[PDB]
Amino acid sequence: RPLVIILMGSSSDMGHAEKIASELKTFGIEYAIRIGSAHKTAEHVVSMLKEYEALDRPKLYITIAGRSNALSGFVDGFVKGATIACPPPSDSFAGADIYSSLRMPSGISPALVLEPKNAALLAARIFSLYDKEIADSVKSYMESNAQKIIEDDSK
Amino acid sequence: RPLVIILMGSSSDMGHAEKIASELKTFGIEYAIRIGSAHKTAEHVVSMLKEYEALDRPKLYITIAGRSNALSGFVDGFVKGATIACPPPSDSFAGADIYSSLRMPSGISPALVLEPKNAALLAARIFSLYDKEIADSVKSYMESNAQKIIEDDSK
Amino acid sequence: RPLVIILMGSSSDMGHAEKIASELKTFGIEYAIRIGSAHKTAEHVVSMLKEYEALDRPKLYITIAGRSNALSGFVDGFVKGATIACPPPSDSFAGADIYSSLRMPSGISPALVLEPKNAALLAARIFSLYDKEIADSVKSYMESNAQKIIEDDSKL
Amino acid sequence: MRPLVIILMGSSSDMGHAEKIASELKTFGIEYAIRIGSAHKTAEHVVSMLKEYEALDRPKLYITIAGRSNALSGFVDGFVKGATIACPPPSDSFAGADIYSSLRMPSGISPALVLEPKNAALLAARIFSLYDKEIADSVKSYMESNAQKIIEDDSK
Amino acid sequence: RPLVIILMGSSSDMGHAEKIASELKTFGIEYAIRIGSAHKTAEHVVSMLKEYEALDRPKLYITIAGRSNALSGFVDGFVKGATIACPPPSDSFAGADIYSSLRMPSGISPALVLEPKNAALLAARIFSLYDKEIADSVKSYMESNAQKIIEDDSKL
Amino acid sequence: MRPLVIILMGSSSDMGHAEKIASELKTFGIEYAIRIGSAHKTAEHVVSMLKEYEALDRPKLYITIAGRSNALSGFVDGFVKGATIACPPPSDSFAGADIYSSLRMPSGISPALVLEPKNAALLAARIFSLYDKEIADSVKSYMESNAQKIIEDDSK
Amino acid sequence: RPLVIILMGSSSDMGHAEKIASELKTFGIEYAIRIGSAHKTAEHVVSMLKEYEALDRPKLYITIAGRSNALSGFVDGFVKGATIACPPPSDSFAGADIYSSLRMPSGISPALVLEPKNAALLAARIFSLYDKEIADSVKSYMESNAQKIIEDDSKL
Amino acid sequence: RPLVIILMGSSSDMGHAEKIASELKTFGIEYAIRIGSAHKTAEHVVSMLKEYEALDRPKLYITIAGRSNALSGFVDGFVKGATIACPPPSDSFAGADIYSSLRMPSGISPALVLEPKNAALLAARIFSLYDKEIADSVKSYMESNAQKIIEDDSKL
Ligand SMILES: Nc1cncn1[C@@H]1O[C@H](COP(=O)(O)O)[C@@H](O)[C@H]1O
Ligand SMILES: Nc1cncn1[C@@H]1O[C@H](COP(=O)(O)O)[C@@H](O)[C@H]1O
Ligand SMILES: Nc1cncn1[C@@H]1O[C@H](COP(=O)(O)O)[C@@H](O)[C@H]1O
Ligand SMILES: Nc1cncn1[C@@H]1O[C@H](COP(=O)(O)O)[C@@H](O)[C@H]1O
Ligand SMILES: Nc1cncn1[C@@H]1O[C@H](COP(=O)(O)O)[C@@H](O)[C@H]1O
Ligand SMILES: Nc1cncn1[C@@H]1O[C@H](COP(=O)(O)O)[C@@H](O)[C@H]1O
Ligand SMILES: Nc1cncn1[C@@H]1O[C@H](COP(=O)(O)O)[C@@H](O)[C@H]1O
Ligand SMILES: Nc1cncn1[C@@H]1O[C@H](COP(=O)(O)O)[C@@H](O)[C@H]1O
């Protein structure tokens, strides 16, 4: 039932998108990967979002755009359910592209998460408030992350 | 049915917490406001989170801590459902406290949102994937934000 | 004659827009002031741009958005002719909102200018390559600025 | 009255950045010239060169290239009548803070700042396109193609 | 005798921890190296600290956490005696992870030291106020560093 | 053999910051002295003062206070045998970047950096507390009370 | 017969220039105060600098320009002897205007000093290498600064 | 008989110091190279500076210390005539070590220059106010830099 739409601004973001998709798969969550720019292909992004919004199933969008991230806010303002911003990494200007993801106007509320695997985790825990299968799979994952540390310690 | 636990590190964060609480109220979402520090009162935060986790109702935590935000990551790692980090504003070191909210390890995934009203919005849209009442109230709110702009334009 | 569309993301940008509009008026350049957000009212911005794009007169767009400026690149990718990004000033995060105006993808080329009077000056000077009336007006304005400096020096 | 872009750089060391801009102007069919002159070390040489270019009866732009503390963009911009574009070479020294020397102009100095060399060439083309129809056709072709690659990437 | 507990948030911090541990060994100071995250294994850290806190010997904790350092303030608020924060080096966001170690609330007082050899030196020097054996060892180490500089100068 | 804290500041202008640190040490029952000396302007005066304090047979710490480029913390730290604490006065010049002059020590120089004056006093108390039981009781009282205010705020 | 030429970019810099001139006057050093912009009035600056350069006497230029400082490099590359950059203070972009004064090309060597009174002191101390009178006046002023600190101390 | 004393904080600075010395040698200026740290060897620096100060001849000190630069202010506050700070380059914290060289107290006026060859040029140009031979050598070198740029241009 759940769907995550992973929407990136450029094919050059694919490496980052696929890290998120891989991790969604570990949690049993269906995803779609799509490409569309809020600067260059604005009407194509709008028509694509109308198709997804029309589907009667619980959904999240994870929005990926490097440089000045117009995409996350654009998507977030169009759709009605929650969204997650997960920009690809950059060291340009000491990582200052990050501000274009953080500094939203009033009424625009994408969830910002830096790491791709953490973005996928957040999606899974959003669904888990009402989805017992996903909830069970997040529980197993997080406990295993905690076990690794305790096991590393005892060694 | 939904519950948002608003957990701040210090009573001096209350002004910021109350902005979030006010806005949750506009969406018909029950909240609890609580105080506890991840540096100073770690066992008290743990016992408080066990009580909330024990409740069989869909829940989110919104975690508020100024300066170096240990709280959001601490809470996020303990609980199983999603959390939101919403630190109070600061201009110390050009706002560099923000990094302590962004830079999470692997497996820790709080949603970072700067504005208090946007944090509340995000909570509401998380619930709205499965809650028709809240979904209807987010729809009305966001459409009214969009109408304001179009109305400002026509003037 | 030339037209400048001053498009801002919020009514709260109006004081900044008015400074740009006032300066354009001193060069005798017609303007229009409009409001629309790239986040909250994308289709309204799309619809509005299609209207301005259909006018047969030389035009520039001056795009104003505080915080994370999605508006300038959005408009820039939509319209045919040049645009100018002139964000309102902010000292939050030591002014780091500016990077959201600077960091464009390939094929998006808004001119970034900080001061609202300088954004109006650049717009004038874009038209001046072909518009002699605006060129003379720019010339008098720039010569005037230069003369004030020289007079300030000689008065010491 | 054919368009001209003068690409003026502060040092021979900037040549590779200048060539990326020249190359892209060539795809738009816009004539350019590449010149060298320092606002710090060869001020009178720059003034003499600008006076020569300024005398030409043709629509012109200057794209100004200087690394480190960019004195050149403001210097040229304050001297010439028509619009200019600042396109500094990339640097990660001090986390890119050389950029502030291109951004922070006094009143009356209005160079258009664009980071990417291809985007500086595109802004140049789109400035002429307000009046030059052939350049406008070439810009629509270029920007349409950028957009089609994206749609095409998605559908693939 | 003195004990230093070197507590790091992840196995990936081990190379940094080992540099601190090696340096302590040159001052003849006993250490223990442990792993626990303030985010992922809070109760394990609580349980571990209660064990070390029950030892009747002078102790310091040296706390190592990359990224947003929750670990140092968490341990510092829990234990009675002093602690030292020594985060692993990072150049992400121009090193801005450092602020997560600096910006403590009221009543949380870890000593921040950047270099792992300097964190070990501070720990030694904390003990040295009361431990003559560590004091002589510190004295020889510091005099030695000073002599190398003077010898480098005289050799020129 | 009673604890002593020497609070050494670079200028009389730092006095208000020094007093906040002295006040808090007083609540812990720790004797202090407040002195003035510049590592830039009065180097020999500082060396002479440090030699006097260093000769005392009692557990001692130096808390060093210098605004702007902090030469003083490293200067004192390299001179004395036992631990030191850097606690610079607050500044928002250059977005607080004076802090890097307290953080970036060479090898062999290990002052403890703490931002808040009350926290620098607490770190001092907790350094002595490893060996001094009365100070440890006073620290538990203090930190327990901080924690109780919080629990008490929540339950109210 | 030393001369220090204080050249600023705008009359709005006059308050900063007056602090420098005042301090120069305390050392018995003659100054001239002048206004000219490297962006808006380049030829005016060149002709001004020609007049001073033609004076057969030991001279320094102190160059003041806010925002992107094109002036100090421009002056420095033109004149023969040493120059000093002392820009006015700014909090814009976390004080990032400073980079425009720091980041010079090869062959351009203005001395950067932040504080106006310290810019005047460096000027004195430059001349003092060969001017015995200024060496006496610098010596008494610096000694007087040291003595103030020692007296402030002795009162505690 | 000018003397430039190049004083560095650590032998690890030697590569940077050698670039300065090399360039001084091209202007016919005698230099000495010395090592001493303001943190670890303060008395050694003081006694060294006493020896050079006692020389009846025109001198400058060029002070090199990486990380938190305590050295330039320390040297500058001690000696009578002008000094120059030229720290080694660093990318640590986005180059924020630079602030430790910029942010001086009242009465401390080291000239800050980034590039080693420019530090040597400022040294020359300081002496050139009264030394006719160095003025000739500076003049030919600066003219030669200008001519290179004009020749690079003329080839395009
Ligand atoms: N900010 C933005 C707007 N449209 C695309 N981008 C982003 O800018 C970078 C460069 O895009 P392109 O490959 O189209 O030049 C990519 O990360 C892409 O997500
Ligand atoms: N970082 C942190 C850890 N424990 C509390 N804080 C935060 O630090 C600031 C100062 O807290 P206090 O009032 O306890 O000094 C408050 O915003 C609080 O959320
Ligand atoms: N970045 C952005 C996207 N949509 C509007 N903004 C800008 O965000 C600020 C706050 O907008 P509002 O008043 O809509 O909250 C305004 O400067 C506005 O231009
Ligand atoms: N800022 C400046 C002033 N004069 C030239 N530049 C720039 O400084 C860098 C180094 O110049 P040079 O090669 O002359 O040392 C080059 O990018 C050049 O454009
Ligand atoms: N900040 C934090 C909280 N818990 C662990 N970390 C740190 O985050 C980094 C990545 O941790 P992991 O290897 O657990 O992903 C490590 O430096 C670790 O100390
Ligand atoms: N960095 C430094 C060197 N000597 C003194 N300071 C500090 O610089 C500031 C100004 O010093 P003054 O009052 O002497 O001008 C004060 O905080 C002082 O501690
Ligand atoms: N950078 C520059 C070039 N020409 C003048 N300035 C500086 O820009 C600021 C504003 O100048 P104006 O008053 O001309 O707008 C002033 O500090 C002035 O020295
Ligand atoms: N700041 C300072 C004080 N004493 C030496 N340094 C500098 O710190 C760096 C490392 O010094 P060391 O080699 O002594 O660790 C070198 O650039 C040196 O000049």
What is d(CA D89, CA D20) in angstroms, rounded to the nearest whole number?
A: 11
Q: Which residues pair with D85 in a beta bridge?
A: D63, D112
The three-point CA angle B130-A132-A54 to 5° equals 30
Which three-class secondary structure state does DSSP give residue A47? helix
Is F69 a pocket residue for ligand 6 (Cβ < 6 Å)?
A: yes
Strand order in the sheet with B30-35: A30-35, A3-8, A59-64, A83-85, A111-112, B111-112, B83-85, B59-64, B3-8, B30-35
Which H/E stretch holds residue G91? none
Give, as one character, the DSSP assignment of residue D138.
Answer: H
Cα–Cα dist F55/E152, whole Å = 29
State the greatest distance between any 2 C-alpha atoms of chain B, in Å, as a whole number. Answer: 56
Decide whether any atom of ligand 2 lies within 6 Å of the B39 Cβ. Answer: yes
Strands (E), D1-156: 4-9, 31-36, 60-65, 84-86, 112-113
Cα distance between the two ends of chain C: 43
- Give the contacts of E40 (CB within 8 A, at least 6 positions apart): A142, A145, A146, A149, B77, B105, B107, B108
End-to-end CA distance of chain G: 44
Tokens of C39: 């986040």
Q: Does the beta carbon of A147 sit less than 6 angstroms from any atom of ligand 1?
A: no
D14 annotated to bind ligand = yes
Q: Chain centroid to CA H83: how far?
A: 7
Q: Of ligand 3's atoms, which has the minimum distance to the CA of residue C12?
A: 13
Token representation of residue C19: 């400074």
Residue H114, both tokens: 């980034």
Q: Cα-atom radius of gyration of chain H, to the nearest Å?
A: 16
Ligand closest to E115 (CA) is: 8
Q: Quick one: tokens of H123?
A: 């040294």
Residue (of G109, G127, G89) closest to G4 by Cα position: G127
Q: Report whether H95 belongs to an annotated binding site.
A: no
Q: In sequence order, which ranges of chain C are alpha helices (DSSP H)?
A: 14-26, 42-53, 71-78, 99-102, 116-128, 132-155
CB contact at 8 A, H86 and H123: no
Residue D7 CA, ligand 4 centroid: distance in Å: 15
Task: Give, in degrees to the nearest 5, the angle at Cα A48 between A47 and A50.
Answer: 65
Distance CA F61, CA F54 (A): 10
Tokens of E15: 């190379």
Determine phi and psi for A78, rounding to 5 degrees: -80, -45
d(CA C72, CA D129): 19
- Round to whole Å and give the CA distance between B36 and F35: 39
Here the tokens at position E103 are 């910006």
Q: What was the structure determination method?
A: X-ray
At residue H140, what are phi and psi to the nearest 5 degrees? -60, -40
CA–CA distance, C27 with C11 (Å, rounded to integer): 25
Task: Please tell me which of the candidates B35, B92, B96 has its beta carbon nearest to residue F153.
Answer: B35
Q: Is C78:C22 a contact under the CB 8 Å cutoff?
A: no
CATH code: domain of residue C130: 3.40.50.1970
| 3-state SS, residue D111 | coil
Element (H, E) at D106: none
For residue B92, which residues of chain F lie inside 8 Å, CB to CB?
Answer: 92, 96
Q: Which residue of B has its CA nearest to E90?
A: B103
Of E95, E142, E153, the CB nearest to H35: E153
Return the H-helix or E-strand segment holding H74. Answer: helix H71-78
Closest partner residue to G58 (CB to CB) among H84, H107, H130 is: H130
Q: How many CB atoms lie within 10 A of CB H77?
A: 24
Helix or strand holding residue B11 (H, E) = none
* Distance between CA atoms of residues H27 and H126, nearest Å: 12
C30 SS3 class: strand
Would the CB atoms of A149 and E94 count as touching at under 8 Å?
no
CA-based nearest residue in chain H for residue F93? H103
Contact predicate B129/B60, CB 8 Å: no
**Which tokens in the block code for residue E80?**
């009675």
Q: Pick from G137, G8, G152: which is nearest to G84 by CA? A: G8
Number of domains forming the structure of chain H: 1
Q: Report the C-alpha gap between B96 and B68 in whole angstroms.
A: 9
SS (H, E, C) chain F: CCCEEEEEECCHHHHHHHHHHHHHHHHCCCEEEEEECCCCCCHHHHHHHHHHHHCCCCCEEEEEECCCCCCHHHHHHHHCCCCEEECCCCCCHHHHHHHHHHHCCCCCCCCEECCCHHHHHHHHHHHHCCCCHHHHHHHHHHHHHHHHHHHHHHHC
Determine the Cα–Cα distance for residues A80 and B135; give it in Å rounded to an integer.
Answer: 8
Q: What is the DSSP letter of E38?
A: T
Which residues in chain B have their CB less than 8 angstroms from residue C48's CB?
A: 153
| Residue at token pair 């045919």 | C80
B86 - beta bridge partners?
none
Q: Provide the 8-state DSSP code for D89.
A: P
Report CA-CA distances (Å) from B139 to B59, B125, B146, F40.
Answer: 21, 9, 11, 64
Which residues does residue H64 pair with via DSSP β-bridges, in sequence order? H8
Residue H17: which of H52, H66, H57 has the closest Cα? H66
DSSP C87-101: PPP--GGGGGGGHHH
Q: Which ligand is nearest to the CA of A104?
A: 3
* Ligand 2 mutation target, pool B37, B63, B91, most atoms within 8 A of CB: B37
Q: Do D143 and A40 touch (CB under 8 A)?
A: yes
Q: Is F77 annotated as a binding residue?
A: no
Q: Residue ranges of the alpha helices (H) in chain E?
A: 14-26, 42-53, 71-78, 99-102, 116-128, 132-155
**Does the beta-carbon distance from F35 to G153 stay under 8 Å?**
yes
Residue E68 counted as an annotated binding residue: yes
F8: which strand partners?
F35, F64
Cβ contact C150–G44 (<8 Å)? yes
* C-alpha pair distances (Å), A135 with each of A138, B145, E37: 5, 34, 23
Q: What are the phi and psi torsion angles at H56 (to 5°)?
A: -85, 80
Q: What contacts H66, CB < 8 A, 6 or more positions away? A: F106, H9, H10, H12, H13, H87, H88, H90, H97
Distance from C-alpha of B80 to C-alpha of B71, rounded to nearest angstrom: 15
For residues D125 and D56, the answer to whether their CB atoms sit within 8 Å is no
Q: Residue D79 is which amino acid?
A: F
Distance A52 CA to ligand 6 centre (A): 62
Q: How far is CA D94 from CA B112, C12, H89, in A?
A: 28, 34, 10
Looking only at Cα atoms, what is the longest distance across chain C?
A: 57
Distance between CA atoms of H30 and F69, rounded to whole angstroms? 31
How far is residue B94's CA from residue G93's CA, in Å, rounded to a whole number?
9
Residues of G in contact with F98 (CB under 8 A): none
Q: CB of B87 closer than 6 A to ligand 2?
A: no
Whether the Cβ atoms of residue A49 and residue A75 lie closer than 8 Å to each other: yes
Q: Using alpha carbons, select from F56, F53, F61 the residue that is nearest to residue F28.
A: F61
Amino acid at A91: D
CA distances from D97 to C53, D15, D67, D94, G63 (A): 37, 21, 11, 5, 22
Is E137 annotated in a binding site? The answer is no
How big is chain D by its Cα radius of gyration, in Å?
Answer: 16
Query: Cβ–Cβ of B105/E67 closer than 8 Å?
Result: yes
Exposure class string for A100-119: b at 16+ Cβ within 10 A, else e:
bbbbbbbbbbbbbbbbbbbb
Radius of gyration of the CA atoms of chain E, in A: 16
Q: How far apart are CA F27 and CA F24, in angstroms?
A: 5
- DSSP assignment letter at C110: P
Q: How far apart are CA F71 and CA F73, in angstroms?
A: 6
Nearest to A70 among C38, C66, C96 (CB): C38
Phi, psi of D60 (to 5 degrees): -130, 150
Give CB contacts under 8 A, 24+ apart, made by E144-149.
E145/F107, E145/F108, E145/H40, E146/F78, E146/H40, E146/H41, E146/H44, E149/H10, E149/H11, E149/H35, E149/H36, E149/H37, E149/H40, E149/H41, E149/H44
Q: Which two tokens stand for residue G26?
A: 């305390």
Strand partners, E34: E7
Which residue is associated with the tokens 């060129």? C135
Question: Do residues F38 and H106 touch, judged by C-beta distance below 8 A?
Answer: no
Residue written as token pair 């969604």: A24
Q: At what angle do helices F43-54 and F72-79 cross, to 10 degrees?
A: 40
Radius of gyration of chain F (CA): 16
Look at residues E105, E61, E108 and name the one whose alpha carbon lies nearest to residue E86: E61
Using an 8 Å CB-CB cutoff, list chain F residues near G87: none
In sequence order, the 6+-apart residues with CB closer than 8 A to the CB of F28 are: F121, F122, F124, F125, F135, F138, F139, F142
The rounded distance, in Å, linking the Cα atoms of E81 and D132 is 76
Q: Which of H118, H139, H141 sits opposite G108 (nearest CB)?
A: H118
Q: Closest Cα to atom 10, ligand 1: which residue?
A: C105
Look at the block and give the residue holding tokens 């003499």: D48
Residue B13 labelled as part of a binding site: yes
Residue nearest to ligand 8 atom 17, measured at CA: H66
CB F81 within 8 A of CB F54: yes
Supply G57's token pair. 């006497």
Tell whether ligand 1 has an atom less than 6 A from the beta carbon of residue A68.
Answer: yes
- List, in order, residues 6 or more apart from C112 with CB less than 8 Å away: C84, C85, C86, C101, C102, D103, D112, D113, D114
State which residues form the domain around G120.
1-156
Chain E residues whose CB is inside 8 A of the B102 CB are: 68
User: Is any ligand 5 atom within 6 A of the Cβ of residue E90?
Assistant: no
**Mutation test of ligand 7: which of G6, G8, G10 has the most ligand atoms closer than 8 Å to its C-beta?**
G10
* Secondary structure (DSSP) of H84-126: EE-PPP--GGGGGGGHHHH---TT--PEE--SHHHHHHHHHHH
Bridge partners, residue F61, by sequence: F5
- Cα separation, E142 vs A37, in Å, equals 59
Return the partners of chain C (3 or more C-beta pairs < 8 Å).
A, B, D, G
Establish whether residue A131 lines the binding site of ligand 1, counting it when its CB lies within 6 angstroms of any ligand atom: no
Is residue A64 within 8 Å of residue A13, measured between CB atoms?
A: yes
Which contiguous run of DSSP H or E holds residue E56?
Answer: none
| Tokens read off for E26 | 């040159």
Q: Taking CB atoms and an 8 Å cutoff, what residues of chain E touch B66? A: 105
User: φ, ψ for residue C86 (rounded to 5)?
Assistant: -140, 85
